[PDB]
From a paper:
OSM‐3 belongs to the homodimeric kinesin‐2 subfamily and is the Caenorhabditis elegans homologue of human KIF17. Similar to KIF17, OSM‐3 is involved in intraflagellar transport in the distal part of the cilium, and both proteins are autoinhibited at the resting state. The OSM‐3 motor domain shows the typical kinesin fold, with a central eight‐stranded β‐sheet surrounded by 3 α‐helices on either side.
Indeed, OSM‐3 crystals diffracting X‐rays up to a resolution of 2.3 Å were obtained in these conditions. In the case of OSM‐3, this density is well accounted for by a sulfate ion that likely comes from the crystallization solution. Finally, we note that the overall temperature factor of OSM‐3 was unexpectedly high (about 87 Å2) for a 2.3 Å resolution structure, likely reflecting further the instability of this kinesin in the absence of a nucleotide.
Numbering used by the authors: 0 to 159, 165 to 195, 203 to 239, 254 to 338
The structure:
């Protein structure tokens, strides 16, 4: 019912083989106890930032999920809208935090964890019956496409907010969700750096009193945040966040891109939103990391108004 700011967590990825070979300097510092993130310049001069979560090179998707995503997914199951999106330059770790890996068990991402969590929590609740639906879309060069639809290479129209004609796939267990994510990656545009993608899980709960709640979860993997209408949605996103927090902007320019129009309810609206800002640890990425930290620091101040979406008969 009440005003709720956007939760922001920073996740610094570990060095990569090449950063180790080059003998790259660790310019990023963290003190997770108070969500502190520092960025050291080549001379030593540090820049300090405070976030709701700081995850250093040794962090797992298992610990980020438990701390930040798990209470949001419980909120979704109660009839709330929830949005989790990854922000950061190409290479920073956005996809590793969203999808993750299944050969290091603690490094499974927030997406397959939300599937296991939703299906386990809905199976334990005997006082509410549940219908799970799943959609998956991609926005490349302002062209919205349905990664699950019958014609995966067709542009879609938006009406008000919804993507008019997007397929909503019913899921009866976790493997049904995993089949859509697998088939959705094969429908990505080739003719994954400059495109964005939204995977939504809708949780409809019918209670014994009779009322029905409808909460949805948006799992957003954004395009690379690196400097340079291919970048229209990314520039509009920053402009939207800027308008939302600058205090002078009475009119938020959501209609300036396909991504901002869709995620409009997740930025200032009836949604509990979480941003996962992914950063690289190496000094060769100083400018992009500084850009991402400043951008995520501004996102902290977006004021949403999430309420329970539960209509009684």
């Amino acid at each position: 019912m009440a005003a709720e700011s956007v939760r922001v967590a920073v996740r610094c990825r570990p060095f990569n083989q090449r950063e180790k070979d080059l003998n790259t300097t660790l310019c990023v510092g963290m003190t997770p106890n108070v969500g502190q993130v520092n960025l050291n310049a080549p001379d030593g001069a540090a820049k300090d930032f405070t976030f709701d979560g700081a995850y250093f090179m040794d962090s797992t998707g298992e610990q980020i999920y438990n701390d930040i995503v798990f209470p949001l997914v419980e909120n979704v199951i109660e009839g709330y809208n929830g949005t989790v999106f990854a922000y950061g330059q190409t290479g920073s770790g956005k996809t590793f935090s969203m999808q993750g890996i299944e050969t290091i068990p603690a490094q499974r991402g927030v997406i397959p964890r939300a599937f296991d969590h939703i299906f386990t929590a809905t199976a334990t609740t005997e006082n509410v019956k549940f219908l799970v639906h799943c959609s998956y879309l991609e926005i490349y060069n302002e062209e919205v496409r349905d990664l699950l639809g019958a014609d995966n290479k067709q542009k879609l129209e938006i009406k008000e907010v919804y993507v008019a004609g997007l397929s909503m796939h019913v899921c009866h267990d976790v493997p049904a969700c995993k089949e859509l994510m697998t088939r959705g990656f094969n429908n990505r545009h080739v003719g994954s750096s400059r495109s964005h993608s939204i995977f939504t899980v809708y949780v409809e709960g019918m209670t014994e009193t009779g009322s029905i709640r409808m909460g949805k979860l948006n799992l957003v993997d954004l395009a690379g945040s690196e400097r340079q209408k291919i970048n229209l949605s990314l520039s509009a996103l920053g402009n939207v966040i800027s308008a939302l927090v600058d205090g002078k902007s009475k009119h938020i320019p959501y209609r300036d891109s396909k991504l901002t129009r869709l995620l409009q309810d997740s930025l200032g609206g009836n949604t509990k939103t979480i941003m996962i800002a992914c950063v690289s640890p190496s000094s060769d990425n100083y400018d992009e990391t500084l850009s991402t930290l400043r951008y995520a620091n501004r996102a902290k101040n977006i004021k949403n108004k999430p309420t329970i979406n539960e209509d009684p008969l």
